Design a protein around this ligand. Structure first.
Ligand SMILES: Nc1nc2c(ncn2[C@@H]2O[C@H](COP(=O)(O)O[C@@H]3[C@H](O)[C@@H](COP(=O)(O)OP(=O)(O)OP(=O)(O)O)O[C@H]3n3cnc4c(=O)[nH]c(N)nc43)[C@@H](O)[C@H]2O)c(=O)[nH]1
Ligand SMILES: Nc1nc2c(ncn2[C@@H]2O[C@H](COP(=O)(O)O[C@@H]3[C@H](O)[C@@H](COP(=O)(O)OP(=O)(O)OP(=O)(O)O)O[C@H]3n3cnc4c(=O)[nH]c(N)nc43)[C@@H](O)[C@H]2O)c(=O)[nH]1
Ligand SMILES: [Mn+2]
Ligand SMILES: [Mn+2]
Ligand SMILES: [Mn+2]
Ligand SMILES: [Mn+2]
Ligand SMILES: [Zn+2]
Ligand SMILES: [Zn+2]
Lengths: 352, 341
DNA sequence: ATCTGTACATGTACAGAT
DNA sequence: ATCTGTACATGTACAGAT
DNA sequence: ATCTGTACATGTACAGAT
DNA sequence: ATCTGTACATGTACAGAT
């Protein structure tokens, strides 16, 4: 039923290995070049993030997310107009990206990008170009034409080892689920800043960064139970990741047909399900035999977020991803009707 | 009932503070002398172990265990007569690495430093053979002992005899196990019974387990449910201590026996709900039953070293074991009279 | 001669394949 | 049920540098 | 290399509520 | 009698500074 859908969504070991071998070649080579010279990004380290590395990538192994993180000691953060998620950075190889002590995201991203393009240019091993910059994106995106099309977001990131910013104090409400020790430990890991890089025309546009908890989200996905043995070989298997996939698929399929859904992304579904997992902590509430009622209750939750125009960042409570400012009421009522319809007619869109 | 017993066993915030301040003074000072002065034990680091640091110490804060661990480069181990737990070490004034030679110098230093402490009342206990410890007796108005335990630290994968040990897969899980087994392992100068023999120590791992003892991550946390696993451990420790005070026939038994047994019980009964505080009685009782079966069958395997039987004939006489069986059985079947002294 | 950043060596969880 | 490739963590060997 | 500052877990003690 | 909330105490990991 939904079992058969997940079978379709299941990646193939063969495709995984073909995609993985090529992607690793390129990434490895880019990462070397960032140190290989007296470059401003020497010391940058690699951290694989996103769905593929969380084992929730569906349909094909054709999008990979990688974080090129750089430790910046001695950092002063200033929150950008109470938004919660956006900051200026202040205070050395970075010398050339400063705006009198302020660190320009776009200056740094540009140099990062220029290097990447140069390195890609000198790869006649594999078929690979760099995608035209999209505004409001921190990524340098590689398009690889293995006989199959594969995208890789290379994401520049600052790494701070200090305590997380105050706006996250009330975030990550895992106490009743994964517990206090997991939370304290996670919050001792560093936090990450990535360029916002929009070209809206607003003040500080080019010097604004945004927080990233991709590393933490990865730990959670791969350690998702109240019982330590959830999904392990001497444990009981849950259906938490399976729900995540199914919901990801509903949004993808809808997004490929209807352009009224451009404002929506998978991060919305991931955020929503983090909330659901907090709300329903017990592994027994995600029993595989209850895949249907579980997926259904996730859908119901998501619709309520759309209806009430409210879906809080899981790490930054005050930052509403479903604000009027970010997504139109119309866009939200439109997605509400499409989800409601699919739900009440057997999920036609799963058969396409 | 047994709730009332635990109250008696509960340490007092005041005594904890007084004992802790004095113990830390001494340990801090010993640790400095090992490093800040040019000794063979130059890079030695501190790691607190045992009941007090596991929060299972009963009655009084009067015995403290501390490990002075030393990072020692790539070493070769060779198993001492198949026991599983005892090894010779190989590859500087202690050379094959003699446990006794090393322990002696370690001890000499400690004695010298203790000698020049006019701050606090503190002597060094007469050496007990087949003990890895230098034991300090501190006469705060209250008597307090501190085992300073020399330990070699190896970063290599654990020895082959432990491959089948630490059977936590159905309890704490495979990820916890793999991770724990990536931590280093420790060799302690316990003389085996000879003089160049070390013994493995998993005090660091036992500490993680005591403080992360549930199948649910929230066991005993502030947004979790409280279990009675540590309470059973205390109760069983107390039964053994009280019995040991009365009967010399029980000199061969120690709390490590009880701790080992309960590790097995926790493995056998993984679910936090099987250690519900409302079931303190049935839980303690089933622990007793398990321990008697170990005594009856003369078998209690080291939790980390399966082939090493702590209840072998070679280590404890049949008579000693039948004697403890009768005493435990009696206490059990008459409401634990011994808990009222 | 010693030291070291880099690459290899070892081990295992996760999940896909048989 | 067993087997197998990938990703990821930690230990160690070593050519090139000091 | 060593030390201090910070944050929070695991305790204990006790009052007021259930 | 037990539970819940607060205060008070110790232990411990790690970052940033010296
Ligand atoms: N892969 C992917 N790309 C999408 C999706 N919807 C739109 N896009 C593309 O994103 C570009 C513009 O950026 P955006 O802000 O609209 O989209 C981001 C981000 O790209 C998307 C999720 O992408 P991901 O990080 O690769 O996701 P993951 O690996 O978890 O799953 P999968 O890739 O399999 O879907 O979500 C948006 N987003 C918004 N806020 C955040 C945030 O804080 N973190 C992250 N990680 N993403 C965020 C355009 O090219 C557009 O086409 C989509 O569903 N998937
Ligand atoms: N504290 C204590 N001392 C005891 C006990 N029974 C006997 N002793 C004294 O130890 C001397 C040496 O004999 P032993 O080798 O049989 O004793 C050891 C060890 O002393 C004892 C447990 O001591 P601990 O490590 O301080 O205990 P823990 O901190 O877990 O709890 P607590 O101190 O609250 O009881 O058990 C014996 N033992 C045997 N194998 C091991 C092992 O692998 N590890 C450890 N740690 N101990 C082991 C005798 O002369 C006597 O005076 C006793 O119950 N407690
Ligand atoms: Mn992705
Ligand atoms: Mn992406
Ligand atoms: Mn002890
Ligand atoms: Mn001791
Ligand atoms: Zn699971
Ligand atoms: Zn517990």
């Amino acid at each position: 039923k939904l079992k058969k859908v997940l079978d379709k969504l299941r990646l193939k070991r063969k495709d995984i290995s073909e995609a993985a071998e090529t992607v690793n070649k390129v990434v490895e080579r880019l990462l070397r070049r960032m140190q290989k010279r007296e470059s401003e990004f020497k010391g940058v380290e690699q951290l694989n993030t996103g769905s593929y590395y969380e084992h929730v990538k569906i349909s094909a192994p054709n999008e990979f997310d990688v974080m090129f993180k750089l430790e910046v000691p001695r950092i002063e953060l200033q929150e950008y107009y109470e938004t919660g998620a956006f900051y200026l950075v202040k205070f050395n190889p970075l010398s050339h990206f400063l705006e009198g002590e302020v660190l320009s995201a776009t200056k740094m991203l540009s140099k990062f990008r220029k290097i990447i393009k140069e390195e890609v240019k000198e790869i006649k091993d594999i078929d690979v170009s760099v995608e035209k910059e999209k505004p409001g994106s921190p990524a340098v995106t590689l398009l690889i034409r293995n006989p199959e099309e594969i995208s890789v977001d290379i994401i520049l990131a600052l790494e701070s080892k200090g305590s997380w910013p105050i706006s996250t104090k009330e975030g990550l409400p895992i106490q009743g689920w994964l517990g206090t020790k997991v939370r304290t430990n996670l919050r001792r890991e560093p936090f990450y800043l990535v360029p916002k890089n929009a070209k809206d025309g607003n003040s500080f546009q080019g010097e604004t960064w945004r927080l990233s908890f991709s590393h933490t989200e990865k730990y959670i996905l791969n350690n998702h139970g109240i019982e330590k043995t959830c999904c392990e070989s001497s444990g009981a298997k849950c259906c938490r990741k399976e729900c995540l996939k199914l919901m990801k698929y509903l949004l993808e399929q809808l997004k490929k047909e209807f352009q009224e859904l451009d404002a929506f992304c998978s991060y919305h579904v991931k955020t929503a399900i983090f909330h659901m997992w907090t709300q329903d902590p017990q592994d027994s509430q995600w029993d595989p035999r209850n895949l249907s009622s579980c997926f259904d209750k996730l859908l119901a939750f998501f619709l309520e977020c759309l209806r009430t125009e409210k879906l809080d960042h899981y790490f930054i409570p005050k930052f509403n991803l479903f604000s009027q400012e970010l997504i139109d009421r119309k866009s939200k009522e439109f997605l509400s009707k499409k989800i409601e319809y699919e739900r009440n007619n057997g999920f036609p869109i799963f058969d396409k």
